[PDB]
Design an enzyme around this catalytic site. Structure first.
Site, PDB file in Angstrom:
ATOM      1  N   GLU A   1      -5.018   3.891 -10.953  1.00 37.44           N
ATOM      2  CA  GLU A   1      -5.779   2.662 -10.735  1.00 37.44           C
ATOM      3  C   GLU A   1      -6.902   2.569 -11.764  1.00 37.44           C
ATOM      4  O   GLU A   1      -7.140   1.509 -12.353  1.00 37.44           O
ATOM      5  CB  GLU A   1      -6.366   2.615  -9.322  1.00 37.44           C
ATOM      6  CG  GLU A   1      -5.341   2.431  -8.222  1.00 37.44           C
ATOM      7  CD  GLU A   1      -5.980   2.388  -6.848  1.00 37.44           C
ATOM      8  OE1 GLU A   1      -6.341   1.274  -6.412  1.00 37.44           O
ATOM      9  OE2 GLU A   1      -6.120   3.460  -6.205  1.00 37.44           O
TER      10      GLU A   1
ATOM     11  N   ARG B   1      -0.319   4.525   2.791  1.00 33.78           N
ATOM     12  CA  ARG B   1      -0.213   4.318   4.223  1.00 33.78           C
ATOM     13  C   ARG B   1       0.190   5.523   5.083  1.00 33.78           C
ATOM     14  O   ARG B   1       0.249   5.388   6.299  1.00 33.78           O
ATOM     15  CB  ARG B   1       0.774   3.179   4.507  1.00 33.78           C
ATOM     16  CG  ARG B   1       0.270   1.770   4.225  1.00 33.78           C
ATOM     17  CD  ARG B   1       1.364   0.770   4.604  1.00 33.78           C
ATOM     18  NE  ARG B   1       2.345   0.643   3.522  1.00 33.78           N
ATOM     19  CZ  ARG B   1       3.506   0.014   3.637  1.00 33.78           C
ATOM     20  NH1 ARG B   1       3.840  -0.531   4.806  1.00 33.78           N
ATOM     21  NH2 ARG B   1       4.331  -0.066   2.585  1.00 33.78           N
TER      22      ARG B   1
ATOM     23  N   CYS C   1       0.790  -1.231   0.000  1.00 39.87           N
ATOM     24  CA  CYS C   1       0.000   0.000   0.000  1.00 39.87           C
ATOM     25  C   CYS C   1       0.825   1.286   0.000  1.00 39.87           C
ATOM     26  O   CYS C   1       1.544   1.584   0.953  1.00 39.87           O
ATOM     27  CB  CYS C   1      -0.977   0.039   1.181  1.00 39.87           C
ATOM     28  SG  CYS C   1      -2.080   1.480   1.146  1.00 39.87           S
TER      29      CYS C   1
ATOM     30  N   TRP D   1      -9.398   6.215  -0.860  1.00 38.61           N
ATOM     31  CA  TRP D   1      -9.723   6.884  -2.113  1.00 38.61           C
ATOM     32  C   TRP D   1      -8.723   6.468  -3.213  1.00 38.61           C
ATOM     33  O   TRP D   1      -7.645   5.945  -2.935  1.00 38.61           O
ATOM     34  CB  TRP D   1      -9.727   8.407  -1.928  1.00 38.61           C
ATOM     35  CG  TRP D   1      -8.496   8.930  -1.274  1.00 38.61           C
ATOM     36  CD1 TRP D   1      -7.280   9.185  -1.873  1.00 38.61           C
ATOM     37  CD2 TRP D   1      -8.341   9.267   0.110  1.00 38.61           C
ATOM     38  NE1 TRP D   1      -6.391   9.662  -0.939  1.00 38.61           N
ATOM     39  CE2 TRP D   1      -7.014   9.720   0.285  1.00 38.61           C
ATOM     40  CE3 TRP D   1      -9.194   9.218   1.222  1.00 38.61           C
ATOM     41  CZ2 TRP D   1      -6.521  10.131   1.531  1.00 38.61           C
ATOM     42  CZ3 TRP D   1      -8.704   9.634   2.458  1.00 38.61           C
ATOM     43  CH2 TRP D   1      -7.379  10.080   2.601  1.00 38.61           C
TER      44      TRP D   1
HETATM   45  C1  HEM Z   1      -6.420   6.402   1.729  1.00 39.66           C
HETATM   46  C2  HEM Z   1      -6.024   6.276   0.454  1.00 39.66           C
HETATM   47  C3  HEM Z   1      -5.416   4.964  -0.108  1.00 39.66           C
HETATM   48  C4  HEM Z   1      -4.716   4.910  -1.233  1.00 39.66           C
HETATM   49  C5  HEM Z   1      -4.365   6.096  -2.158  1.00 39.66           C
HETATM   50  C6  HEM Z   1      -4.318   3.538  -1.444  1.00 39.66           C
HETATM   51  C7  HEM Z   1      -3.580   3.099  -2.503  1.00 39.66           C
HETATM   52  C8  HEM Z   1      -3.322   1.786  -2.787  1.00 39.66           C
HETATM   53  C9  HEM Z   1      -2.921   1.309  -4.087  1.00 39.66           C
HETATM   54  C10 HEM Z   1      -2.738   2.202  -5.327  1.00 39.66           C
HETATM   55  C11 HEM Z   1      -2.742  -0.003  -4.000  1.00 39.66           C
HETATM   56  C12 HEM Z   1      -2.331  -0.909  -5.172  1.00 39.66           C
HETATM   57  C13 HEM Z   1      -3.658  -1.453  -5.678  1.00 39.66           C
HETATM   58  C14 HEM Z   1      -3.535  -2.115  -7.018  1.00 39.66           C
HETATM   59  O1  HEM Z   1      -2.728  -1.631  -7.854  1.00 39.66           O
HETATM   60  O2  HEM Z   1      -4.267  -3.115  -7.236  1.00 39.66           O
HETATM   61  C15 HEM Z   1      -3.045  -0.412  -2.637  1.00 39.66           C
HETATM   62  C16 HEM Z   1      -2.953  -1.681  -2.119  1.00 39.66           C
HETATM   63  C17 HEM Z   1      -3.357  -2.054  -0.867  1.00 39.66           C
HETATM   64  N1  HEM Z   1      -3.944  -1.231   0.089  1.00 39.66           N
HETATM   65 FE1  HEM Z   1      -4.064   0.852  -0.007  1.00 39.66          FE
HETATM   66  N2  HEM Z   1      -4.801   2.752  -0.417  1.00 39.66           N
HETATM   67  C18 HEM Z   1      -5.504   3.604   0.428  1.00 39.66           C
HETATM   68  C19 HEM Z   1      -6.158   3.182   1.568  1.00 39.66           C
HETATM   69  C20 HEM Z   1      -6.069   1.910   2.103  1.00 39.66           C
HETATM   70  C21 HEM Z   1      -6.751   1.438   3.294  1.00 39.66           C
HETATM   71  C22 HEM Z   1      -7.747   2.292   4.111  1.00 39.66           C
HETATM   72  C23 HEM Z   1      -6.410   0.149   3.484  1.00 39.66           C
HETATM   73  C24 HEM Z   1      -6.831  -0.842   4.594  1.00 39.66           C
HETATM   74  C25 HEM Z   1      -7.303  -0.441   5.784  1.00 39.66           C
HETATM   75  C26 HEM Z   1      -5.482  -0.225   2.446  1.00 39.66           C
HETATM   76  C27 HEM Z   1      -4.879  -1.459   2.353  1.00 39.66           C
HETATM   77  C28 HEM Z   1      -4.264  -1.964   1.239  1.00 39.66           C
HETATM   78  C29 HEM Z   1      -3.869  -3.346   1.071  1.00 39.66           C
HETATM   79  C30 HEM Z   1      -4.011  -4.519   2.069  1.00 39.66           C
HETATM   80  C31 HEM Z   1      -3.268  -3.400  -0.335  1.00 39.66           C
HETATM   81  C32 HEM Z   1      -2.686  -4.640  -1.029  1.00 39.66           C
HETATM   82  C33 HEM Z   1      -3.863  -5.465  -1.521  1.00 39.66           C
HETATM   83  C34 HEM Z   1      -3.362  -6.689  -2.252  1.00 39.66           C
HETATM   84  O3  HEM Z   1      -2.398  -7.344  -1.787  1.00 39.66           O
HETATM   85  O4  HEM Z   1      -3.947  -7.019  -3.310  1.00 39.66           O
HETATM   86  N3  HEM Z   1      -5.283   0.873   1.623  1.00 39.66           N
HETATM   87  N4  HEM Z   1      -3.388   0.714  -1.918  1.00 39.66           N
HETATM   88  C1  LIG Z   2      -7.371  -8.205  -8.286  1.00 44.01           C
HETATM   89  N1  LIG Z   2      -6.153  -7.879  -8.212  1.00 44.01           N
HETATM   90  C2  LIG Z   2      -5.367  -8.267  -7.049  1.00 44.01           C
HETATM   91  C3  LIG Z   2      -6.095  -7.790  -5.811  1.00 44.01           C
HETATM   92  C4  LIG Z   2      -6.691  -8.709  -4.944  1.00 44.01           C
HETATM   93  N2  LIG Z   2      -7.345  -8.302  -3.844  1.00 44.01           N
HETATM   94  C5  LIG Z   2      -7.441  -6.995  -3.561  1.00 44.01           C
HETATM   95  C6  LIG Z   2      -6.864  -6.034  -4.396  1.00 44.01           C
HETATM   96  O1  LIG Z   2      -6.999  -4.708  -4.087  1.00 44.01           O
HETATM   97  C7  LIG Z   2      -5.959  -3.756  -4.241  1.00 44.01           C
HETATM   98  C8  LIG Z   2      -6.301  -2.571  -3.360  1.00 44.01           C
HETATM   99  C9  LIG Z   2      -6.509  -2.705  -1.988  1.00 44.01           C
HETATM  100  C10 LIG Z   2      -6.829  -1.597  -1.203  1.00 44.01           C
HETATM  101  C11 LIG Z   2      -6.944  -0.342  -1.790  1.00 44.01           C
HETATM  102  C12 LIG Z   2      -7.267   0.790  -1.044  1.00 44.01           C
HETATM  103  C13 LIG Z   2      -7.376   2.012  -1.704  1.00 44.01           C
HETATM  104  C14 LIG Z   2      -7.143   2.078  -3.082  1.00 44.01           C
HETATM  105  N3  LIG Z   2      -7.223   3.240  -3.763  1.00 44.01           N
HETATM  106  N4  LIG Z   2      -6.854   0.967  -3.775  1.00 44.01           N
HETATM  107  C15 LIG Z   2      -6.744  -0.222  -3.163  1.00 44.01           C
HETATM  108  C16 LIG Z   2      -6.438  -1.326  -3.937  1.00 44.01           C
HETATM  109  C17 LIG Z   2      -6.188  -6.428  -5.543  1.00 44.01           C
END
Ligand code: HEM
Ligand SMILES: C=NCc1cncc(OCc2ccc3ccc(N)nc3c2)c1
Ligand code: HEM
Ligand SMILES: C=NCc1cncc(OCc2ccc3ccc(N)nc3c2)c1
Ligand SMILES: C=NCc1cncc(OCc2ccc3ccc(N)nc3c2)c1
Ligand SMILES: C[C@H](O)[C@H](O)[C@H]1CNc2nc(N)[nH]c(=O)c2N1
Ligand SMILES: C[C@H](O)[C@H](O)[C@H]1CNc2nc(N)[nH]c(=O)c2N1
Ligand SMILES: [Zn+2]
Lengths: 413, 408
Positions: free
Chosen positions: A288, A114, A111, A283
Site C-alpha cells: 500500500e 478479513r 478487503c 494495519w
Molecule cells: C487488519 C489489517 C487490515 C489489512 C491488512 C487490510 C488490507 C486492506 C487492503 C490492502 C485493502 C485495499 C486498499 C487499497 O488498495 O486501496 C483493503 C480494503 C478495504 N478494507 Fe481492509 N485491511 C485491514 C483492516 C480493515 C478493517 C479493520 C476494516 C473495516 C472495519 C477494513 C475494511 C476495508 C474496506 C471496506 C476496503 C475497501 C475500501 C474501498 O472500497 O475503497 N479493513 N483492506
Molecule cells: C482512494 N482510493 C479509493 C478508496 C476510497 N475510499 C477508501 C479507500 O481505502 C482503502 C482501504 C480501506 C481500508 C483499509 C484498512 C486497512 C488497510 N491497511 N488499508 C485499507 C485501505 C480507498
C-alpha cells in the site's frame, strides 16, 4: 440465480461451493451482458423502506446468536417496529452495533485482511454532539489502535443519519494523511492525492508548514454543522522513517510514512441505518505504501530517483528498471516497519492468510464475497496465491459504502 | 445507456456505446459478478446468426443495404435450406478472423488486430493435410525471428461427429514427465497431454525441454502424431546480462506462441481448429511459465544463486528473483533478434489502442483481470484504467479438451 456456484483454485485444484450469494442484497453494476468489476464506483429512508431492512438485520443477528424465533427475537422485532412507526428510525442495541460493524468488515469484498474481522474494537460514539467531542473520540481511537506500534483494529461510530441535514462527517479521507501543495510552477510538494483537501483546510484557517510530510488537521462535522479544524497531537501520530537493509543511501531520500491506516470517509450501513462517520483502522500491507503511495505516478512518484541512485539503465523500458526499483522500495518499507516494531504485513503473508480465511468462510458461512481486482496486490500478482483463485463478488449487508465527498454536498451555515 | 470509463492516473474519460451491440452473456448477473471466473446448431438458429454477421460485414465495407448485400443474404438463406449450413466467402473469412481477435477482451496485444495473416485451410481432409498446413503456418509466422501474426482455419464443424481438432493446446510446447519420486520433469502443464502422446506411440527423449509432437484430428477421425521439423522450431537460450551464472540454469524457451485449442466462431459457424499465433509478452514466459508453482517453478533455484535470504517471505526474495528472470527473458530474445514485447510497452500500446477503439468504434471490450500483467501491475497504465467487459462476435471461445469427447 443457481443455488450452488463453484470456484476453482487453478494452482491447487481446490474447488469450493458458494451458497452465501443467495443472500446478496444489492446490485453489483454488472448485468448478464456487461461486467463492471473494474469500475471503481459502479433524502433518507422512509418508514416503509426501513421496516424490512431492519427485520432482515435483526433476524440475521438473532440467527447468529442461535436465538432465532425466540421470545427475545420476537420482542426485539416488536420494539424495533414500534420505534420506526413512531420516530421514523430506530436505535441499535450495543450488541447489535458491534455485530453489525464486525460484519460490514467481514462482508467487505475488497478487503484482503478479513481473517481478522472478528477481532475489532468497536467504540460507540453515538452520544457525541459536537466537533470537539468527535476530536476527543478520534484521539482516543488513534491512541488505542496505535498501541505503541502493536496495532489493533478498531472503529469509532458516530450518530447515525436522521433527516440528512444533521450528518456527522469526517472530511478527512483518512485520520492521518500528508498534505499536498500545488506550486505556482505546476509542481507538487507532499502528496498529490491530498491537494484538494489540503486547500480546503487552508481555506478553513489551517496554517500549513509547507513540507513534504505534514500531517493534515482533522476537519470534523457534527450534527450537520460547518466542519471544524483540530490538530492531532503529534505524539499520537506514529511514523516510520524508511531505510534499506543494503542501500545505506536510501535513508538520504528523506522518506517516512505513518504507521496507522485509518479510513474515515466511508459509510457504515446497518439494518437500514446510515452511519456517515465511522472511521476504522487496521494495519498496512506493505505494498500500500511501497507500490501505491510511493510509486503511483500521481502520488509520491519516487521510482526515477530510486532508480537513479541504484544506477540502473533507465533508457529502455525492457531493462525493467522500474520493476527492479519497485521491489527494493517495498523491501525498505517492510524492513523499516519491522525494525521499529510497527505492525505491517507483506503481500505474500496477507494473501496466503486470506486464502485460508476464504476457505474457512466457504466452509462455515457458505461463501466469501471477494473482489479479485482489489484482492490481488499491485505488484508480483501471479506469485501470490490469490491470483490463481477464482472469486465471486456480491454485496452483503451490513456493509461499508462509498459516499460523496462532504464539501460537494455541505450546506454552509 | 452510454457508459463511461475513467483512467484514474490520467483522468481521461471515454464513452462506451459499443457494448449496446453485444448479444452474448458474460457470466455476471445484477447480483453476482464473475469477472474472475476463468470459464463462466439448427437452420432456425443458424440464419439469424449468419444475417447479423453478414450485416456487419456489409456495414464494415460501406455497402449496407446494397444489392450485393441483399443477394448475399438470399444466397446464404438458400444454402442453409439446402445444406443445413453455409460457406463464408474468403473476404468474410478474413474479416471474421480479424474481428475475433479485435473482440478478444483478454488480449493486450490487440493494437495489431488488423495485421493478421489468414490461412484458409477449409479444403483440408486429413491429419497429414493438417500437418502440412501447420508447418507452413509455423514457418511463415516465425519468419527467422521477425514474428508475424497468423491464423490457420480448418473446416467448420458439421454434425459434431467430424470435428477437426488440434489436440495440442499450443503448436509448440514442452513435454512434462511424471517422475517416480513424485516430482515432475519438464513442464507440469503438459503432463497429461504428454502421456497421451506416449500412449499413442511417441518416443519421449525424457528431457526438460522436449518439443511435443503434433497430434492432429481430421474429420472426427482418431488423432495422428507428427514431429514438427526441428529447423522450423525457433528457440532462445535464456541468459542474463549481469549474472553470468544464469545460463548455467539450462533454460530455454520457444519463440512462437501459437494457441491451438480454441474455437473460432463467425456468423454461427464453428471452427474447432484454428491455430493462431503472435509473439510473446515477456511475462508470459518469465512470470507464468517459469514461476507458477504448477509450472517450471524456478524461483527457489534462482534466489539460491542470487544468494538471497529466503528465510522470511518479507525479504521479498521471490519478487527479486522474479524481476531478474524477466530481465533475462527479454534480454535473451532481444539479443537473438526474436520478437518480444515487455509488459510496460505492451500495456502502453493497449491504452493507445483503447483510445483508438473508443474513437473509431465507440468502445473496446476489455478484461482487466487478464489485461493487467502478472507482475508490477500498478506501475503499468492498464492497472489504473477502468474497463468494460462484454462479448462481441466474431469471437474466440473455449472448448472442451478433445480427449474428454472423442470416441476412438
Ligand atoms: C487488519 C489489517 C487490515 C489489512 C491488512 C487490510 C488490507 C486492506 C487492503 C490492502 C485493502 C485495499 C486498499 C487499497 O488498495 O486501496 C483493503 C480494503 C478495504 N478494507 Fe481492509 N485491511 C485491514 C483492516 C480493515 C478493517 C479493520 C476494516 C473495516 C472495519 C477494513 C475494511 C476495508 C474496506 C471496506 C476496503 C475497501 C475500501 C474501498 O472500497 O475503497 N479493513 N483492506
Ligand atoms: C482512494 N482510493 C479509493 C478508496 C476510497 N475510499 C477508501 C479507500 O481505502 C482503502 C482501504 C480501506 C481500508 C483499509 C484498512 C486497512 C488497510 N491497511 N488499508 C485499507 C485501505 C480507498
Ligand atoms: C501479436 C502479439 C500478441 C500479444 C503480445 C498477445 C498477448 C496476449 C497475452 C499476454 C494474453 C494473456 C494470455 C495469458 O496470460 O495466458 C493474450 C490473450 C489472448 N489473445 Fe493475444 N497476443 C497477441 C496476439 C494475438 C493473436 C494474433 C490472437 C488471435 C488471432 C490473439 C488472441 C487472444 C485471445 C483469444 C486471448 C484470450 C485467451 C483466453 O481467453 O484464454 N492474440 N494475448
Ligand atoms: C433458414 N431459412 C429460413 C429462414 C429463417 N429465418 C429467417 C429467414 O430469412 C431469410 C432472409 C432472406 C433475405 C433477407 C434479406 C434481407 C433481410 N433483412 N432479411 C432476409 C432474410 C429465413
Ligand atoms: C493458461 N491459461 C488459460 C488459457 C487456456 N487456453 C488458451 C489460453 O491462451 C492464452 C493466450 C492466447 C493467445 C495468445 C496470443 C499471443 C500471446 N503472446 N499469448 C497468447 C496467450 C490461455
Ligand atoms: C481502474 C481500477 O479498477 C482501479 O485502478 C483499481 C484496480 N485495483 C485496485 N486494487 C486495490 N487494492 N486498490 C486500488 O486502488 C485499486 N484500483
Ligand atoms: C482466477 C483467475 O481468473 C485466473 O487465475 C486468471 C487470473 N488472470 C489471468 N490473467 C492472464 N493474463 N492470464 C491468466 O491465465 C490469468 N489467470
Ligand atoms: Zn462482473
Amino acid at each position: 440465480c443457481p443455488r450452488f456456484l463453484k470456484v476453482k483454485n487453478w494452482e491447487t485444484e481446490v474447488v469450493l461451493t458458494d451458497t452465501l450469494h443467495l443472500k446478496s442484497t444489492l446490485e453489483t453494476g454488472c448485468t448478464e451482458y456487461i461486467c463492471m468489476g473494474s469500475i471503481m464506483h459502479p433524502d433518507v429512508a422512509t418508514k416503509d423502506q426501513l421496516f424490512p431492512l431492519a427485520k432482515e438485520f435483526i433476524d440475521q443477528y438473532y440467527s447468529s446468536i442461535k436465538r432465532f424465533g425466540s421470545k427475545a427475537h420476537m420482542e426485539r422485532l416488536e420494539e424495533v417496529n414500534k420505534e420506526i412507526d413512531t420516530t421514523s428510525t430506530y436505535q441499535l442495541k450495543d450488541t447489535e452495533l458491534i455485530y453489525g460493524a464486525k460484519h460490514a468488515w467481514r462482508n467487505a469484498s475488497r478487503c484482503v485482511g478479513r481473517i481478522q474481522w472478528s477481532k475489532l474494537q468497536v467504540f460507540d460514539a453515538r452520544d457525541c454532539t459536537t466537533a470537539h467531542g468527535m476530536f476527543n473520540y478520534i484521539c482516543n481511537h488513534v491512541k488505542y489502535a496505535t498501541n505503541k506500534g502493536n496495532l489493533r483494529s478498531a472503529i469509532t461510530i458516530f450518530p447515525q443519519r436522521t433527516d440528512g441535514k444533521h450528518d456527522f462527517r469526517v472530511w478527512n479521507s483518512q485520520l492521518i494523511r500528508y498534505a499536498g501543495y500545488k506550486q505556482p510552477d505546476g509542481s507538487t510538494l507532499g502528496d498529490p492525492a491530498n491537494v484538494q483537501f489540503t486547500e480546503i483546510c487552508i481555506q478553513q484557517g489551517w496554517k500549513p508548514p509547507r513540507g513534504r510530510f505534514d500531517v493534515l488537521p482533522l476537519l470534523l462535522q457534527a450534527n450537520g454543522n460547518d466542519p471544524e479544524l483540530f490538530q492531532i497531537p503529534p505524539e499520537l501520530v506514529l511514523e516510520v522513517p524508511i531505510r534499506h537493509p543494503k542501500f545505506e543511501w536510501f535513508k538520504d531520500l528523506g522518506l517516512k510514512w505513518y504507521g496507522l491506516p485509518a479510513v474515515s470517509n466511508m459509510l457504515l450501513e446497518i439494518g437500514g441505518l446510515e452511519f456517515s462517520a465511522c472511521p476504522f483502522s487496521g494495519w498496512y500491507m506493505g505494498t500500500e505504501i511501497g507500490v501505491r503511495d510511493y510509486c503511483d505516478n500521481s502520488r509520491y512518484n519516487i521510482l526515477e530517483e530510486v532508480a537513479k541512485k541504484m544506477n540502473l539503465d533507465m533508457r529502455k523500458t525492457s531493462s525493467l528498471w522500474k520493476d527492479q526499483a519497485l521491489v527494493e522500495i517495498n523491501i525498505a518499507v517492510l524492513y523499516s516497519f519491522q525494525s521499529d516494531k510497527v505492525t505491517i504485513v507483506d503481500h505474500h503473508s496477507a494473501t496466503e492468510s486470506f486464502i485460508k480465511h476464504m476457505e474457512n468462510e466457504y466452509r462455515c458461512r457458505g461463501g466469501c464475497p471477494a473482489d479479485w481486482v482489489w484482492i490481488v496486490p499491485p505488484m508480483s500478482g501471479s506469485i501470490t496465491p490469490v491470483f490463481h483463485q477464482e472469486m465471486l463478488n456480491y454485496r452483503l449487508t451490513p456493509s461499508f459504502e462509498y459516499q460523496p465527498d462532504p464539501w460537494n454536498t455541505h450546506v454552509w451555515k
